[PDB]
Amino acid sequence: SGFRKMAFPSGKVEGCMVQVTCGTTTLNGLWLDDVVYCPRHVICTSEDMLNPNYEDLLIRKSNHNFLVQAGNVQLRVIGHSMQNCVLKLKVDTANPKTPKYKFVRIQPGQTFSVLACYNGSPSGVYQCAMRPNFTIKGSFLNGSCGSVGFNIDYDCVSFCYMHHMELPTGVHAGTDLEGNFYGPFVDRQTAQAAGTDTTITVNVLAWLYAAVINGDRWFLNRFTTTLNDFNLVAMKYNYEPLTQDHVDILGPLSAQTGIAVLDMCASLKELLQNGMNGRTILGSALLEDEFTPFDVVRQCSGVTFQ
Amino acid sequence: SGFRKMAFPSGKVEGCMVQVTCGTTTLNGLWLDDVVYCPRHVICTSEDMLNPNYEDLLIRKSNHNFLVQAGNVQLRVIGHSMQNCVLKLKVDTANPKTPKYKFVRIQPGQTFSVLACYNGSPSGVYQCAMRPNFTIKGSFLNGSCGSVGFNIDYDCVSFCYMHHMELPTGVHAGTDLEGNFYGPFVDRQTAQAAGTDTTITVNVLAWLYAAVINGDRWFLNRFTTTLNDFNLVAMKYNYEPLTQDHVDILGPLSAQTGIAVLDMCASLKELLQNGMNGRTILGSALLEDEFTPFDVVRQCSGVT
Numbered sequence: 001s002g003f004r005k006m007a008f009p010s011g012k013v014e015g016c017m018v019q020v021t022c023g024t025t026t027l028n029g030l031w032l033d034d035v036v037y038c039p040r041h042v043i044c045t046s047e048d049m050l051n052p053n054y055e056d057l058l059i060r061k062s063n064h065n066f067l068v069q070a071g072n073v074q075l076r077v078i079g080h081s082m083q084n085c086v087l088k089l090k091v092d093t094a095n096p097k098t099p100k101y102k103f104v105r106i107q108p109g110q111t112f113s114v115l116a117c118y119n120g121s122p123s124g125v126y127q128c129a130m131r132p133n134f135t136i137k138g139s140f141l142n143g144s145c146g147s148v149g150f151n152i153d154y155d156c157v158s159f160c161y162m163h164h165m166e167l168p169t170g171v172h173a174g175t176d177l178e179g180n181f182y183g184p185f186v187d188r189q190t191a192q193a194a195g196t197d198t199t200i201t202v203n204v205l206a207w208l209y210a211a212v213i214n215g216d217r218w219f220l221n222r223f224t225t226t227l228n229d230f231n232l233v234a235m236k237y238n239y240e241p242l243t244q245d246h247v248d249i250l251g252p253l254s255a256q257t258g259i260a261v262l263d264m265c266a267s268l269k270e271l272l273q274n275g276m277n278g279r280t281i282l283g284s285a286l287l288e289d290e291f292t293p294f295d296v297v298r299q300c301s302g303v304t305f306q
Numbered sequence: 307s308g309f310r311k312m313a314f315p316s317g318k319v320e321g322c323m324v325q326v327t328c329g330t331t332t333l334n335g336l337w338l339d340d341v342v343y344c345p346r347h348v349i350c351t352s353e354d355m356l357n358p359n360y361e362d363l364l365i366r367k368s369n370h371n372f373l374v375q376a377g378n379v380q381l382r383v384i385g386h387s388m389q390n391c392v393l394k395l396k397v398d399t400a401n402p403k404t405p406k407y408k409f410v411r412i413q414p415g416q417t418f419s420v421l422a423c424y425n426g427s428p429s430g431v432y433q434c435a436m437r438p439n440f441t442i443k444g445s446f447l448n449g450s451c452g453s454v455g456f457n458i459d460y461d462c463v464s465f466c467y468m469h470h471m472e473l474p475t476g477v478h479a480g481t482d483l484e485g486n487f488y489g490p491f492v493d494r495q496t497a498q499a500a501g502t503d504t505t506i507t508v509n510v511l512a513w514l515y516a517a518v519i520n521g522d523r524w525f526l527n528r529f530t531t532t533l534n535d536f537n538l539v540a541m542k543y544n545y546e547p548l549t550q551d552h553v554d555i556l557g558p559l560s561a562q563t564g565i566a567v568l569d570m571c572a573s574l575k576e577l578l579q580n581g582m583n584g585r586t587i588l589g590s591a592l593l594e595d596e597f598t599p600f601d602v603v604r605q606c607s608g609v610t
């Protein structure tokens with residue numbers, strides 16, 4: 001029993017973190033095989049950030065303008081290239097600790113673990129979700145760029161996020177490992193701002209299924225709903241629309257608990273209307289939306305406490 | 307900016323997890339140098355758990371009764387002994403991945419990271435606090451015994467918890483790595499229950515300082531209080547008493563924000579008496595108590 005924001009064990013990623021320096025700027029890089037990946041903004045000064053021309057900034061650099069440090073060892077850069085907003089530094093040594101990995105671009109609502117790093121050294125690990133507005137609510141300070149997000153389902157690390165910056169509301173923006181930003185964000189100091197965020201409905205439903213698996217049903221009711229009437233209500237509380245794909249993904253949790261998805265939707269409609277009335281669900285006084293259906297299956301028992 | 311429940315990176319501990327089997331029972335063990343540590347209840351059948359005489363059950367076991375697997379490698383057991391509620395299996399191979407470590411016993415209110423494991427394989431990491439009632443609100447299923455809790459300082463892992471059991475309310479109990487239980491719990495299938503818990507006041511104050519650092523200041527006010535008047539309110543609301551040592555431990559956060567601890571106590575007193583009036587602090591509608599003052603400094607200063 002229990003239910004916690006559970007990250008993946010971070011060791012396979014810790015062994016890939018390095019420090020990258022270009023001039024006076026230092027940030028983190030990810031060392032996989034003979035390539036170190038990092039935000040291309042490592043080649044900018046603070047002044048360059050208003051309107052950088054990265055092609056022009058990069059042509060002016062040699063391989064030896066990049067210093068890469070892995071623990072106490074300097075790696076020699078032997079090539080460089082830019083792919084979208086990531087810089088790829090080829091080094092003379094393949095990382096002997098490279099795990100089995102892949103790169104995956106995720107969709108809004110998906111979760112991942114973040115290994116926050118500073119100066120190439122890991123500081124901590126926590127879970128995040130890609131918000132519907134393409135930001136993440138992380139915990140990052142100056143020096144954290146280049147920290148990555150990943151999942152490790154089945155011994156393969158799937159890297160899905162690299163940190164590039166903090167927006168004015170204190171939320172975070174970054175790219176996939178091919179250097180494409182999530183959302184409309186750019187690696188330039190523009191007036192970009194996080195759009196209005198919404199709640200990840202399918203994840204709130206998955207977390208209510210977790211609460212039923214763990215033994216609580218107080219929030220259920222005798223009603224059902226159509227999918228369209230549920231979306232018309234949910235959108236008034238700034239919840240994302242629930243699609244038939246989301247209903248399908250909740251199928252295994254519905255089967256384990258015997259609660260039809262549209263009947264859990266009716267329970268959520270009533271929780272939005274009433275609140276908790278001084279109760280909590282899985283230790284929370286608010287509806288949680290950063291556990292996916294897959295995350296609930298990963299953590300909960302496969303037997304419901306009936 | 308931002309404030310998350312953050313665990314320590316778990317790699318140094320992952321390299322120490324192994325599977326221990328005794329008869330039909332399999333659980334996790336911690337392999338440091340040439341010793342594997344695990345709960346002593348690994349030697350019990352379900353029937354033995356009702357009234358185990360561990361000395362007698364262990365006297366009936368020899369080295370060959372224990373199978374230890376580290377990944378795909380079988381480690382041969384060459385000695386065994388118990389220390390309190392932990393079994394120590396001496397193995398023929400020293401763990402080449404043993405980190406610098408210590409065994410430390412923590413106090414209620416302190417936090418730590420848990421590496422949940424099953425079949426010797428790490429599955430997940432999360433942050434927990436030792437509650438005032440000596441339980442932990444973990445997340446564990448069958449097969450998780452032997453999972454450990456730890457903190458890291460520089461390169462040294464301080465192991466502080468080994469998982470033994472779940473209580474009827476779904477919370478967890480276990481020992482330090484010397485096998486001494488936290489709380490009045492025993493490794494026997496007999497009636498046991500978590501006692502009434504209380505809220506860790508010093509941690510709620512640390513989290514209010516984290517909220518101010520992150521720009522959430524609505525709960526600040528012109529008032530101050532005294533330690534005695536504040537403690538009368540803490541007692542009424544089932545909060546732990548605040549001591550002068552807690553005021554001193556909050557010193558660095560008080561210096562960083564410029565807010566005296568008794569000034570923040572007056573804010574907490576008003577939140578206890580009035581609620582949040584529909585507002586949230588750091589995204590929470592509850593007063594969070596599983597961040598210590600050091601956890602806030604660690605996260606708000608980027609310690610690696």
Ligand SMILES: O=C(c1cncc(Cl)c1)N1CCCN(Cc2ccccc2Cl)CC1
Pocket residue numbers: 041049140141142143144145164165166186187188189190307
């Ligand atoms: O280390 C951090 C940082 C990360 N995360 C959080 C915090 Cl509080 C600081 N930096 C360091 C300088 C680099 N810029 C890049 C940039 C700023 C604004 C628009 C776009 C871009 Cl790409 C990011 C800021």
Ligand SMILES: O=C(c1cncc(Cl)c1)N1CCCN(Cc2ccccc2Cl)CC1
Pocket residue numbers: 001347446447448449450451470471472492493494495496
């Ligand atoms: O794997 C788990 C487990 C751990 N954590 C959570 C859950 Cl849901 C199961 N087991 C496995 C059998 C062993 N007993 C030992 C024991 C039971 C009752 C009183 C005291 C003791 Cl020490 C613990 C239960």
Ligand SMILES: [Br-]
Pocket residue numbers: 528529530531
């Ligand atoms: Br006053």
Ligand SMILES: [Br-]
Pocket residue numbers: 283284285286589590591592
């Ligand atoms: Br909450």
Ligand SMILES: [Cl-]
Pocket residue numbers: 003004005311432433
């Ligand atoms: Cl949590």
Ligand SMILES: [Cl-]
Pocket residue numbers: 153154156158
């Ligand atoms: Cl995968």
Ligand code: NA
Pocket residue numbers: 526527528529530569570572573
């Ligand atoms: Na005040």
